[PDB]
C-alpha cells in the first residue's frame, strides 16, 4: 500500500562489542557469527550478524565484510530493514551504512555489503574506533508488520 495506511513496525537494536578485534585469527574467508538477539521476549524470530575482519574476498580484503544473516525464522520468508554502524570510543555512530529498502530474509539468507569500512581505518588512532581493541557494531533491524498486536492474558489452566 503506497497511498494510504502503512501500519506498525517492530524494530530492535543490538550492540555487539568484539573484544580484541585485532586479534581475530580468522582467514580472509571465514566469518564471525554473534549470538541471537531479538526485540525482547523469547520471540521465535531470531537474527544474527556475520562480520569479517580479514575480509571475505580479495576485492574487499582491505575493508570489512559484514552481512545480516537470518539465524532462524518462524515463517518461510521475512522482510526487514537492516542498518550497520560503528560506535567510536565515545560510543558515537560513525561510518554507518543505512538503506531505505527492505530485502527478503529466509532461514539461511545473507544480505549486506562487501566494503563496509577500511580495516586500517578502525585500528587507526585518529578515529579511535577501538580504544581497547573492541569492535562495537550497532545493528538495527525493523520487521515490517501490519498493525498486528498479539496479546495473551490467557487462563492458567493449572493443576
Swiss-Prot record:
Residues 51-153 are annotated as: Required for nuclear localization. One of its GO terms (molecular function) is identical protein binding. This is Speckle-type POZ protein. Changing residue 67 to A: Strongly reduced affinity for substrate proteins. It comes from Homo sapiens. Interacts with GLI2 and GLI3. Homodimer and homooligomer. Heterodimer with SPOPL. Each dimer interacts with two CUL3 molecules. Part of cullin-RING-based BCR (BTB-CUL3-RBX1) E3 ubiquitin-protein ligase complexes that contain CUL3 and homodimeric SPOP, or the heterodimer formed by SPOP and SPOPL, plus a target protein, such as MACROH2A1, PDX1/IPF1, BMI1, BRMS1 and DAXX. Interacts with IRF1; this interaction mediates IRF1 proteasomal degradation. Interacts with HNF1A. Belongs to the Tdpoz family. Keywords: Cytoplasm, Host-virus interaction, Intellectual disability, Nucleus, Ubl conjugation pathway.
